[PDB]
Amino acid sequence: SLFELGKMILQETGKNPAKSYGVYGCNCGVGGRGKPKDATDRCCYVHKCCYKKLTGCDPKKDRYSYSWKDKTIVCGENNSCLKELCECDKAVAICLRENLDTYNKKYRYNYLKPFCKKADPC
Amino acid sequence: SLFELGKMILQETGKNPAKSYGVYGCNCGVGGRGKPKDATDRCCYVHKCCYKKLTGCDPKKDRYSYSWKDKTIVCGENNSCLKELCECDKAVAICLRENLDTYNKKYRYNYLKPFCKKADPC
Ligand SMILES: CCCCCCCC(=O)O
């Protein structure tokens, strides 16, 4: 759910997940996908494409188990879909951390998302 | 769409809409509804219920025309659904303005939305 996703992003990046990524660029947070603004935005693009493959669980609402071991996200137990979901969320948390170097505040709070160029197919 | 909705909120409140309301409380921005945190949150509660009565258009991506006249939002659609949508968005913009006096920053950036108590039927 939004909670596990946000907590993962926080644990990896050290940044409040909702503030930095809740409405970032053309792909992060609210909305669907769009032409990525930067590398951070591309993380979210990939993430949303990851969500499309899921069958049997709801990435927005369903809760799942993971833990923090040796400063690493470790997906737990779960079933087929929740495991895949957990790994989706882990991957975007890692990707966002990896691209902190080019994170740009000017892409925060983008309620102009409807002006984004249409995203390519996943 | 998110653009018209954001702009209305900005025009009424004077505040960046995505920053203040993109992930606020249990009802504003990302996600569904939940037990309202405060009056600002209840505005968004009502708004999301308003969206449910819409038929013929899609509130998240559909563009529409309104104007700012005598510092008042004036909906300019002769499309029933888009008119209804416009009025939904106008009402929440006004409601948020009216409840600025109790707006609380601590409810901003709530990626803990899944812990919200379940919302009543609209
Ligand atoms: C707490 C907000 C987390 C933003 C999620 C970014 C990835 C996505 O939008 O798919």
Ligand SMILES: CCCCCCCC(=O)O
């Ligand atoms: C970009 C501003 C987003 C705030 C929307 C608040 C109303 C709602 O959540 O239905």
